[PDB]
Design an enzyme around this catalytic site. Structure first.
Site, PDB file in Angstrom:
ATOM      1  N   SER A 174      -4.844  39.476   5.297  1.00 45.48           N
ATOM      2  CA  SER A 174      -3.663  38.850   4.585  1.00 45.48           C
ATOM      3  C   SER A 174      -4.419  37.746   3.030  1.00 45.48           C
ATOM      4  CB  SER A 174      -3.933  37.307   5.168  1.00 45.48           C
ATOM      5  OG  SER A 174      -3.316  36.268   5.541  1.00 45.48           O
TER       6      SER A 174
ATOM      7  N   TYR B 120      -8.347  29.176   8.532  1.00 48.36           N
ATOM      8  CA  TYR B 120      -7.679  31.103   8.438  1.00 48.36           C
ATOM      9  C   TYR B 120      -8.150  31.570   7.118  1.00 48.36           C
ATOM     10  CZ  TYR B 120      -4.348  33.900   8.992  1.00 48.36           C
ATOM     11  OH  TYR B 120      -3.892  35.892   8.818  1.00 48.36           O
TER      12      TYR B 120
HETATM   13  N1  LIG Z   1       1.732  35.348  10.068  1.00 48.99           N
HETATM   14  C1  LIG Z   1       1.798  36.470   8.680  1.00 48.99           C
HETATM   15  O1  LIG Z   1       3.169  36.442   7.911  1.00 48.99           O
HETATM   16  C2  LIG Z   1       0.699  37.451   8.586  1.00 48.99           C
HETATM   17  C3  LIG Z   1      -0.090  37.297   7.244  1.00 48.99           C
HETATM   18  C4  LIG Z   1      -0.874  37.708   6.800  1.00 48.99           C
HETATM   19  C5  LIG Z   1      -1.284  38.130   7.555  1.00 48.99           C
HETATM   20  N2  LIG Z   1      -1.511  38.533   8.716  1.00 48.99           N
HETATM   21  C6  LIG Z   1      -2.516  38.685  10.156  1.00 48.99           C
HETATM   22  O2  LIG Z   1      -1.270  40.137  11.029  1.00 48.99           O
HETATM   23  C7  LIG Z   1      -2.469  41.093  11.929  1.00 48.99           C
HETATM   24  C8  LIG Z   1      -1.465  40.914  12.794  1.00 48.99           C
HETATM   25  O3  LIG Z   1      -0.277  39.970  13.471  1.00 48.99           O
HETATM   26  P1  LIG Z   1       0.629  39.592  14.365  1.00 48.99           P
HETATM   27  O4  LIG Z   1       2.048  39.761  13.953  1.00 48.99           O
HETATM   28  O5  LIG Z   1       0.274  41.263  14.637  1.00 48.99           O
HETATM   29  O6  LIG Z   1       0.369  38.725  15.090  1.00 48.99           O
HETATM   30  P2  LIG Z   1       0.579  39.021  16.366  1.00 48.99           P
HETATM   31  O7  LIG Z   1      -0.213  37.182  17.656  1.00 48.99           O
HETATM   32  O8  LIG Z   1       1.978  39.457  16.900  1.00 48.99           O
HETATM   33  O9  LIG Z   1       0.164  39.915  17.364  1.00 48.99           O
HETATM   34  C9  LIG Z   1      -1.892  39.458  17.690  1.00 48.99           C
HETATM   35  C10 LIG Z   1      -2.124  40.468  18.457  1.00 48.99           C
HETATM   36  O10 LIG Z   1      -3.298  40.058  19.280  1.00 48.99           O
HETATM   37  C11 LIG Z   1      -4.118  39.943  19.950  1.00 48.99           C
HETATM   38  N3  LIG Z   1      -5.585  39.353  19.954  1.00 48.99           N
HETATM   39  C12 LIG Z   1      -4.889  38.310  20.055  1.00 48.99           C
HETATM   40  N4  LIG Z   1      -6.139  38.257  19.988  1.00 48.99           N
HETATM   41  C13 LIG Z   1      -6.862  38.417  21.022  1.00 48.99           C
HETATM   42  C14 LIG Z   1      -7.979  38.676  21.459  1.00 48.99           C
HETATM   43  N5  LIG Z   1      -9.406  37.453  21.293  1.00 48.99           N
HETATM   44  N6  LIG Z   1      -8.310  39.859  22.144  1.00 48.99           N
HETATM   45  C15 LIG Z   1      -8.023  41.451  22.325  1.00 48.99           C
HETATM   46  N7  LIG Z   1      -7.103  40.799  21.487  1.00 48.99           N
HETATM   47  C16 LIG Z   1      -6.233  39.306  20.984  1.00 48.99           C
HETATM   48  C17 LIG Z   1      -3.000  39.290  20.771  1.00 48.99           C
HETATM   49  O11 LIG Z   1      -2.308  40.055  22.552  1.00 48.99           O
HETATM   50  C18 LIG Z   1      -2.121  39.872  19.898  1.00 48.99           C
HETATM   51  O12 LIG Z   1      -1.246  41.424  20.946  1.00 48.99           O
HETATM   52  C19 LIG Z   1      -3.810  39.270  12.201  1.00 48.99           C
HETATM   53  O13 LIG Z   1      -4.944  40.034  11.939  1.00 48.99           O
HETATM   54  C20 LIG Z   1      -2.461  38.269  11.346  1.00 48.99           C
HETATM   55  O14 LIG Z   1      -4.273  37.451  10.315  1.00 48.99           O
HETATM   56  C21 LIG Z   1      -0.012  37.839   9.374  1.00 48.99           C
END
Ligand SMILES: NC(=O)c1ccc[n+]([C@@H]2O[C@H](COP(=O)([O-])OP(=O)(O)OC[C@H]3O[C@@H](n4cnc5c(N)ncnc54)[C@H](O)[C@@H]3O)[C@@H](O)[C@H]2O)c1
Ligand SMILES: NC(=O)c1ccc[n+]([C@@H]2O[C@H](COP(=O)([O-])OP(=O)(O)OC[C@H]3O[C@@H](n4cnc5c(N)ncnc54)[C@H](O)[C@@H]3O)[C@@H](O)[C@H]2O)c1
Ligand SMILES: NC(=O)c1ccc[n+]([C@@H]2O[C@H](COP(=O)([O-])OP(=O)(O)OC[C@H]3O[C@@H](n4cnc5c(N)ncnc54)[C@H](O)[C@@H]3O)[C@@H](O)[C@H]2O)c1
Ligand SMILES: NC(=O)c1ccc[n+]([C@@H]2O[C@H](COP(=O)([O-])OP(=O)(O)OC[C@H]3O[C@@H](n4cnc5c(N)ncnc54)[C@H](O)[C@@H]3O)[C@@H](O)[C@H]2O)c1
Lengths: 267, 267, 267, 267
Positions: free
Chosen positions: A142, A155
Site C-alpha cells: 500500500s 494500518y
Molecule cells: N482501499 C484501497 O484503495 C487500498 C489502498 C492500498 C492498498 N490496498 C490493499 O489492497 C489489498 C486488497 O484489497 P481489496 O480491495 O481486495 O479489499 P476487499 O475487502 O475487497 O477484499 C479483501 C478480501 O480478503 C478476505 N479476507 C479478509 N480477512 C481475511 C481473513 N482473516 N482470512 C481470510 N480471508 C480474509 C476477504 O474475505 C475479502 O475477500 C489489501 O491488502 C489492501 O490493504 C487497498
C-alpha cells in the site's frame, strides 16, 4: 499470455484487488489457488474459472488454513510458482486520538494478525513448495507503507511492516525464492475494517493523484503479472514498486505540474 | 507480443543493456529508434531488425542531436510512445582520493553530461511527442543510484541525480506523461569511461548478489517492457524499481541468507 | 546543560540504551520519568539520580500502565516535554524457517505488543500532555527498520512498523507535536526475547560497521538530546536518523572503504 | 557550548544559512573558516567574530580555491574537525519545458559545478586534514534531494546527487572520516540562481509545512551543531536528516492532521 503453465496462490482473492488478480492471472493462462474466508464467493470464483482456479475456505490468520491452502494447491496443480499474500484490512483512516481506549487493543490485534501475521503464515506455509519451484513471493502492500495519511496509526504500521517482510524475506529465502512487493493506491475499493472501530473525487485528482484519474482494479493487475512471469523478473528481489498513481511524487499545491503542457507545447 | 503498435526511442542502445532492450522491444512487436555514438554497432542492429529499427548517430550530450533522433523516430514511425534514456558512462569505481587534481574537473563534466544532461536532453527533445501520445519515460538508473560501492563519487552522484530526474519529471510531466526508473545491478557489461581516467563481479558474487547468480542482459529487459505496456503500468509514475539481484537487501556475512534452506525442509 | 527545565518520559529505561538516556537526560539538566517492568533496576536509577528520576513499574503493553506513567510524570514534574518510547524486545534473529509452527502465533503477539503496541499506547497516554507543552515524540527504531539481517521476520517487521508510526504520527500530531525516529545499530546490549523461543557483533565487525569500532551506549544518547532540544530541532518532524555505524552505506567486500587512506595521503 | 575547541570549515558562509552556521558555531565556542566568493561580506564576517572566524576569498568550483581554504584554515587554527559544504545555487524552480534550448547547457554546468562539484572539491581538499583530525563531513542538502517540486529538473538532480555523495563518501572515508547530510527546507532565503535563467505564506503553512510555521535560519543551525559535536554523533555516518518542517510526512488535503487536537483533548 505471459503466465502459461504458471501456478499462483493468492490470499484474500474472492473480492477486490485479489479477485482482479485471479481473473487476470487465469486470463494470462495461469492456474490460481485462492484462500479466503468467503465460501460462496470462492465457489463463484471457481465456476467463473473452471479448472484453472480452486478455492479453499479458511482464515489467513490461521497457519493451518494456510497449510491447507498450500496443500490443496499442490494437490490440484502440482506446484506453487508464485505466492501473492494479498488479504488485508483497513482501519477507516482512524487517527490515534480517535481510537477509543477500550477498543485500541483488540483493533491492533485484528489489523496486525490479518495484515502482517497472515503474510508471515502464507510464506511459511508455501515455503517448501516455493523452494521446490524456485519461485517468488509478491506481497501486496500500500502507499500507506511509504507515506502517511493513507490510514491511521494501525494500518500505516501494518503496511510499513510488510515492507520489512519484503526486505527480510528477500534476504532469508535467497538464492532460491525471490521476494518482492507491490504497493497499490488510488483504487476503487469495498475494503472493510475491524468490528471494534465505528476523500472526494475532485480533491483526489487535484491534490492526491498526479495521474489525474482513479484507475480500475484491472489496471493494478499488470504489476503482479510482471513479477509472476517466468523470465521477466529473475534479477528482481527485494524490489518495491510504488503503484499508486504517483502519491510520493505529488507537488505542494497541485498533484500534477504539467496540466498546461499540451497547449504550452503547441499540439 | 505485448508491445505491438508501440514506438520506442532508446539512447545508448547499440550495445549492452540498450541493445538487449532494442532486441526485446522489436521482438515484442514494437518499433525502435536508437540514439548512439557508435556507428558500426548501429548498423549491426539495423540489418538485424530490418525496417523496425532506425539508427541515428549522435552524442546524447547534444540537444540538437537528441532532437534529430526524435525527428527521425517520428519520420520513420509517426510517433514516440516510450522514451528510454539509457546511455551512460562509468568511472571505474575510482575513489575521490584516486581522482587526480588535474583530471577531476574534466572527468566531472564528461560523466555528468552523458549520465545526467543526456537524460535531460532526451526528455526535452521527446516532450512534444510523448505529451501527444500520452506516453511514458523510463530511466535506466543503477544500484549506484541507491547504495554506495557501485561506483565512485562521480558515478554514484550521477546515478543518484537521475533518481531526482525520476521524481521531478514524474511531477512535472503529469498527468499525460508517466516517468519511472529501473535500476539494473547484476549486469556484466563493457561499461566504458572518460578518456581523462585510467574487481570482477564473479569474484565477489556471494557478497554482492543474494540471487546467487549472474543474470544475462536479456533478463533485464522485462522491467522496461512492463513500463512500456500501457494496459499494465498505468498507475505507475515516480516508481523506482530496484533490479539489482537484491544488493540493497543483502546480509552482513553473506549476500543470501538461506543457503541451507532446502535441507531444513528436506527437498 | 542543554535540557535544563525539560521533562522526559522514557519507556524501557531501566537498562541498556534506555538507562543511558535516563543518565544523559538527567545529566543534561532534565527530569526523567521511567516506565519499565524491571523493579530492581528502576530502584537502581532512583537512588542514582535522586529526585530527578521517578520509576514506575509496569508493562508497556498495558494502556492504563502507560497512563499511570504519564500521571506520575505530571504529579512529580508537572509536565511532559519529550516522550521516548524505547522499550523493545528481540527475536534472536530467528528465521521464519526456524520459527516453530506452534510458537509462531504467541511469538508474533509477544514481539508486536511490546515493539509496536507499546509505542502506540505511550503516545496515546502522553498525547494530552505533549499537546499542552507543544512537545515532541522520539521513537527508538533500529537498523532492522530499514535493512534486513538486523533480526528475523518478526523483529524486522516491528521495527519497520515503528517507521510507519514516525510518519503517521508526524502528520497526525502536527503542528503542535513533532514526531521523529532515531535508529541505533552498533549497540551491544542484552536485548532479551519472548519466552516462546530459544553471532556476536565483534566477530563480524568489518562486514557490519564502516565506522570500524563499537560505540558505547553513551554515544547513542546525543541524537535523542538533539530531538529533545527545542531551540535545535524545531524544523524536524518525520525525520529518520540512521544511527547504526553506517550499516546502510557499507561496501560489498568490507564495510569501510578507506582502510588504506592515511597512506595514500602520507599521514 | 558544545563546540569548544572545535574547528569547522563552511563553504558559502557569507550569507543565508551558511552565515547562520558561522554565527552559531562561533557562539558555540567553535573556530570557523569560510570560503566564499564575496570579499566584503567575508571581512564583515571576520570582524563580527574576531579571532574565531577567518574568511578566504575564492570559488567553490575551483579545487585550488578549496585547497587555499583548507590551507588557510590549518594555518590559522591548526586543524579541521568538521567540514560543511554548504554553497548552493537555485534554479528558480524552472520546469523542463520552461528551460530554453539555447540556455539549458550552460544552466546545467553552472548549477552542477556549484552544487555537486563544489561539494566534491571541498571534501577532496580537506581530506588530508579530516583524516588527521578523524573528523566529519556534513553536507547541506535540501528537501529537493528527496521530494519533487522543491526546484526544477536541475536543482532537484543536483540535490539528489549530494545524497549520493553522502552515501558514497561515508563508505569511502570510513573508518576515519564520518560523512552525514542535513536536508533543510521551508526557510526564508535570499537564494540566487544562474545568469542563463530569467509560494505564498498562507499556502505554505496549510499545504507545504505540517509544523505550521516558517522558521528562521537560526533554527536550522542546531542540526549542524549536533553533527559537529565531538562525542554526540560518533555512531552517525551515512545519516540523512530531513530538516524541512515535515515536507515528506505532509497529508493529502492539509499539511497537518492535528490542528483540532488542543480543543479535542479538552485542554
Ligand atoms: N482501499 C484501497 O484503495 C487500498 C489502498 C492500498 C492498498 N490496498 C490493499 O489492497 C489489498 C486488497 O484489497 P481489496 O480491495 O481486495 O479489499 P476487499 O475487502 O475487497 O477484499 C479483501 C478480501 O480478503 C478476505 N479476507 C479478509 N480477512 C481475511 C481473513 N482473516 N482470512 C481470510 N480471508 C480474509 C476477504 O474475505 C475479502 O475477500 C489489501 O491488502 C489492501 O490493504 C487497498
Ligand atoms: N555495467 C553494469 O554492470 C551496470 C550496472 C548498473 C547500471 N548500468 C547502466 O546500464 C546503462 C546502459 O549501459 P551498459 O551497461 O549497456 O554499458 P555499455 O557501455 O555497453 O552501453 C552504453 C552505450 O551508450 C553509448 N554511449 C555512451 N556515451 C554516449 C554518448 N555520449 N552519446 C551517445 N551514445 C553514447 C555507447 O556507445 C554504448 O552503446 C548505463 O546507464 C549504465 O550506467 C550498468
Ligand atoms: N541490541 C542492539 O544492538 C540494538 C540494535 C538496534 C536497536 N535496538 C533497540 O534498542 C531499544 C532499547 O532496548 P535495549 O537495546 O537497551 O535492550 P535492553 O533489553 O537492555 O532494554 C530493554 C528494556 O525494556 C524493558 N522492557 C521490555 N519489555 C517490557 C515491557 N513489556 N514492559 C515494560 N518494560 C519492558 C526491559 O526491562 C529493559 O529495561 C530496543 O527497542 C531495541 O530494539 C537494540
Ligand atoms: N531556499 C531555501 O529555502 C533552501 C531550501 C533547501 C536547501 N537550501 C540550501 O541552503 C544552502 C544555503 O542557502 P543560503 O540561504 O545561504 O543561500 P544564499 O544565496 O543566501 O547564500 C549562498 C552563499 O554561497 C556563496 N556562493 C555561491 N556560489 C559560490 C561559488 N561558486 N563560489 C564561492 N561561493 C559561492 C554566495 O556568495 C553566498 O554567500 C544552499 O546549499 C541551498 O541549496 C535552501
Amino acid at each position: 499470455m505471459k503466465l502459461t503453465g504458471e501456478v499462483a496462490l493468492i490470499t484474500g482473492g474472492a473480492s477486490g484487488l485479489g479477485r482482479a488478480l485471479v481473473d487476470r492471472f487465469v486470463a494470462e493462462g495461469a492456474r490460481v489457488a485462492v484462500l479466503d474466508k468467503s465460501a460462496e464467493r470462492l465457489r463463484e470464483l471457481e465456476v467463473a474459472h473452471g479448472g484453472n482456479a480452486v478455492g479453499v475456505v479458511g482464515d489467513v490468520r490461521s497457519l493451518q488454513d494456510q497449510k491447507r491452502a498450500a496443500e490443496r494447491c499442490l494437490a490440484a496443480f502440482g506446484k506453487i510458482d508464485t505466492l501473492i499474500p494479498n488479504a488485508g484490512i483497513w482501519d477507516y483512516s482512524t487517527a490515534l486520538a480517535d481510537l477509543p481506549e477500550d477498543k485500541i487493543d483488540a483493533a491492533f490485534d485484528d489489523i496486525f494478525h490479518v495484515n502482517v501475521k497472515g503474510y508471515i503464515h502464507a510464506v511459511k506455509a508455501c515455503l517448501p513448495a516455493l523452494v521446490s519451484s524456485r519461485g517468488s513471493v509478491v506481497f501486496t502492500i500500500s502507499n500507506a507503507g511509504f507515506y502517511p495519511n493513507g490510514g491511521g496509526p494501525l494500518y500505516t504500521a501494518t503496511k510499513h511492516a510488510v515492507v520489512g517482510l519484503v526486505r527480510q524475506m528477500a534476504f532469508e529465502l535467497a538464492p532460491h525464492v525471490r521476494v518482492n512487493g507491490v504497493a497499490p493506491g488510488g483504487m476503487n475499493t469495498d475494503l472493510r475494517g475491524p468490528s471494534s472501530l465505528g476523500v472526494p473525487l475532485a480533491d483526489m485528482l487535484k491534490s492526491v493523484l498526479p495521474i489525474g484519474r482513479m484507475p480500475a482494479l484491472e489496471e493494478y493487475t499488470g504489476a503482479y503479472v510482471f513479477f509472476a512471469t517466468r523470465g521477466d523478473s529473475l534479477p528482481a528481489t527485494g524490489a518495491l514498486l510504488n503503484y499508486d498513481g504517483g502519491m510520493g511524487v505529488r507537488g505542494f499545491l497541485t498533484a500534477a505540474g504539467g496540466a498546461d503542457l499540451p497547449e504550452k507545447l503547441n499540439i
